[PDB]
Amino acid sequence: FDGGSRGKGEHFPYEQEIKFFAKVVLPLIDQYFKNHRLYFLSAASRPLCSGGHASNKEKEMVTSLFCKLGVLVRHRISLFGNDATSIVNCLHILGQTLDARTVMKTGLESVKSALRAFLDNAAEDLEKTMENLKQGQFTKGVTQIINYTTVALLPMLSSLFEHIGQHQFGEDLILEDVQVSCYRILTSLYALGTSKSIYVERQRSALGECLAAFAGAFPVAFLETHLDKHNIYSIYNTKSSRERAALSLPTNVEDVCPNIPSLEKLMEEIVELAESGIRYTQMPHVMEVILPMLCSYMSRWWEHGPENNPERAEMCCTALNSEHMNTLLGNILKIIYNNLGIDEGAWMKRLAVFSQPIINKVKPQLLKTHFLPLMEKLKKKAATVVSEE
C-alpha cells in the first residue's frame, strides 16, 4: 500500500483486512498483555507464585512481535488512520511485557538481531531529527519524521528504558554495539535538550522523561569517566583495542561523549544556578532536564557507590556520597523556594515525582530540619497550586 497509496487506488483491495487489523488486532494486543503482563514477565524469579510462568520461546516470540510492531509504526503515523496512538499504547505495554534476560541468555539469533536493529533504528532516527532541527528551522519528509519521533519514538523509548532500568535488565541486554547505539542516543537527547530551538521548547518535557529513563537504564557510568576502567561491563573493556579501532568509535572514554559534562562539573553548575535562583525562562534547560538527569543517575548508581558496599570499596565504578545527595536535594528544594513565588508552574509537579526516589533514599534524621523548611516554604503561599512534598 506504500506503492498503491499515491495511485488512484486509495481504496485498497485489502482495505477490509487493514480495517479488521486496526479495529481488532491492536486492541486485543493491548488487553491480553495488560491482563497477563505478569505472566510473561514471570520467569521463575518469584512473580506468579501460583505457577505456570511463560516459556522462554513464548518470551522470545513476544519480543519479536514487539520489534515488528515498532517496524510497522516506523514513519507511518500519518498512514495509520489516527490509530497511531493505539500502536503507541501497544508498544508501550509490550515493552513492559518484554523479558530481556531470558531472551539474551537463551534466544533466537534472528529475534536478537531484530531487537538490536530496532534499537539502532531508533538511534539513527533520533540522530536525523537532531541534524535537521539544527541545520534548518525551515519547515514534508523532515516534518513527518520529526512528528513521528515526538509522537511515538520518544514515549516508546522512554517506556522501554524505564522498564529495563526498574527490572535491571540493562547490564545484560545492552553489551555489544547496542551500547554504541545508545551512546549515540544519549548524545542525541542531551543535545536536543540543551538546544534553544523554539520548536523543541514545545516538546521539551517528553525529552526530559525519555532521557531520564535512559539515564536510569544505562549500565555504564557515563558522567564519571575518570574511573570507568573499574567497570567490567564497559564497552572499552569488553570490546578491547583491536575491535574498538575497528568500530567507528573515538577510542577515548572522555571523547565518546564530548558535549555532556562530568558529574562534578554539573554539580558546580547546579550549585551556581542554585545561588542564582533565576526565573524559569532564563535557563529552563538545566532545571527541567539535567536536574531529573542527575536525580535519576544518582538514584541508579547509589547502590554501586562505595559507601553502599564498604567491602570492596574504591574498586567501584563510580563514587556516590550521601553528602552529594544531600547537596543535590538542597539545590532542588532551595531553587524551588526561589522560584515558587514566581508564578509557579507544572515543571515542579514533574520535578517532585522525579525527585521522589532520592527523597526516599535520604535518611529521616536528614528529613528533619530539611523538609520542615520545605513545609514552611509551602505554607508561605496562602493558596499553593504546586504542592511540593
What does the block give as the cell for 13?
483491495
User: Per residue in 276-291, is it b (16+ CB within 10 Å) or e — as a string?
Assistant: eeeebeeebebbbbbb
What crossing angle do the helices spanning 178-194 and 109-135 adopt, rounded to 10°? 20
What does the block give as the cell for 61?
516470540
Kindly report the three-state secondary structure assignment for every residue of the chain: CHHHHCCCCCCCCCHHHHHHHHHHHHHHHHHHHHHCHHHHHCCCCCCCCCCCCCCHHHHHHHHHHHHHHHHHHCCCCCCCCCCHHHHHHHHHHHHHHCCHHHHHHCCCHHHHHHHHHHHHHHHHHHHHHHHHHHHCCCCCHHHHHHHHHHHHHHHHHHHHHHHHHHHCCHHHHCCCCHHHHHHHHHHHHHHHHHCCCHHHHHCHHHHHHHHHHHHHHCCCCCCCCCCHHHCCCCHHHHHHHHHHHHCCCCCCCCCCCCCCCCHHHHHHHHHHHHHHCCCHHHCHHHHHHHHHHHHHHHHHHCCCCCCCCCCCCCCCCCCCCHHHHHHHHHHHHHHHHHHHCCCCCHHHHHHHHHHHHHHHHCCHHHHCCCHHHHHHHHHHCCCCCCCCC
What does the block give as the cell for 50?
501460583
How many Å apart are CA 96 and CA 167, to the nearest integer? 10
Q: Measuring CA to CA, which residue among 239, 222, 233 is closest to residue 172?
A: 233
- How were these coordinates obtained? cryo-EM
Q: Measuring CA to CA, which residue among 78, 68, 58 is closest to residue 5?
A: 78
CB 88 within 8 A of CB 73: yes
